[PDB]
């Protein structure tokens, strides 16, 4: 149809009004949003002492899935399941047995198991606030020669034990049918956290400047480098 035509718009300074644009990075966010974003930046700007920097070195994604898959096989019983077995026992008692194998949770209970040396694996959340609750757990596990790992997500740990969040999980003993793969997981975990504990005691974290600052700094050093050859 010859009646149809192209009506291009010439943009630019003093030109046609630009169309709707994404101004997300310029939004004047509420106070709550602004503070949480500044909080993230401030943590990485300051130097992080080694005891706190060790929590950034979380378990690898590939190994985390395998570890979490095993944990799902030892979930504690639910509220409905817990009641269902208690009525089966009441009838059994009226009519005239094996120790369960499940994950242990609770910081107070886990710490007792670690001190008693009955814990075979300790899983620690990296996002516990306040962090003082678990900042000392890696040291305790290392001193007791118990393998430990730091995984991402206290909410993910809580979901295993049917709770909103869980600071840490413990495995006192795994079922004999899967003690081989569990042993392999311990070797990988022990080689990444327990073996590197001594060398991580002097690794200060943080000190990372912003993207604009880094680009500006990199430009300055190029001038110095460009003048070194001449």
């Amino acid at each position: 149809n010859p009646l149809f035509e192209k009506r291009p718009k010439q943009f630019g300074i003093g030109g046609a009004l630009p169309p709707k644009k994404d101004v997300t990075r310029n939004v004047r966010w509420p106070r709550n949003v602004t503070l949480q974003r500044k909080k993230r930046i401030l943590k990485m700007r300051l130097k992080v002492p080694p005891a706190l920097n060790q929590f950034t070195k979380t378990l690898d994604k590939n190994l985390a899935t395998t570890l979490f898959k095993m944990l799902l096989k030892y979930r504690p019983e639910d509220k409905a399941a817990k009641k269902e077995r208690l009525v089966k026992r009441a009838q059994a008692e009226a009519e005239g047995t094996k120790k369960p194998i499940i994950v242990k949770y609770g910081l107070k209970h886990i710490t007792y198991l670690i001190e008693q040396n009955k814990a075979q694996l300790v899983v620690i959340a990296h996002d516990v606030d306040p962090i003082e609750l678990v900042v000392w757990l890696p040291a305790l596990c290392r001193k007791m020669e118990i393998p430990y790992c730091i995984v991402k997500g206290k909410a993910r740990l809580g979901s295993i034990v049917h709770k909103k969040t869980a600071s840490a999980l413990c495995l006192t003993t795994v079922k004999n049918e899967d003690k081989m793969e569990f042993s392999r997981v311990l070797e990988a975990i022990k080689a990444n956290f327990n073996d590197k504990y001594e060398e991580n005691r002097k690794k200060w974290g943080g000190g990372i400047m912003g993207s604009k600052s880094q680009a500006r700094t990199k430009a300055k050093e190029r001038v110095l480098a460009k003048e070194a050859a001449q």
Partner: protein
């Protein structure tokens, strides 16, 4: 994406009150009924002349009664229609209503029924 640089609080659902118990056990009784509104007719000489000269009935009414309620009270009380109602607050603090009946009704006839004439 956001096309506005100013953040606006998003709309959120609001429920209507559904109390588990009523705050008041029962509604209060009507304190401005027809008898309460119409206290008594005025039988002064000035008031009487308006019964025949203007077909108007002069009443002393509750100070909290408005022209709308006075009109309905007279309709229920004496079963008569009103052309217009004029009200004033007397120097003694009471309210007086000048009630003019429609031509279809005769104030003098109604006055005799009331028992003032």
């Amino acid at each position: 994406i956001r096309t506005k640089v100013t953040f606006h609080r998003p709309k959120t659902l609001k429920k209507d009150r559904s109390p588990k118990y009523p705050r008041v056990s029962a509604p209060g009784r009507n304190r401005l009924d027809q008898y309460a509104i119409l206290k008594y007719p005025l039988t002064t000489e000035s008031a009487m002349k308006k019964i025949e000269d203007n077909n108007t009935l002069v009443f002393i009414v509750d100070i909290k009664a408005d022209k709308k309620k006075i009109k309905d009270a007279v309709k229920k009380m004496y079963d008569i229609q009103i052309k217009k109602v004029n009200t004033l607050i007397r120097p003694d603090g009471t309210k007086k209503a000048y009630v003019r009946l429609t031509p279809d009704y005769d104030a003098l006839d109604v006055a005799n029924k009331i028992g003032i004439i």
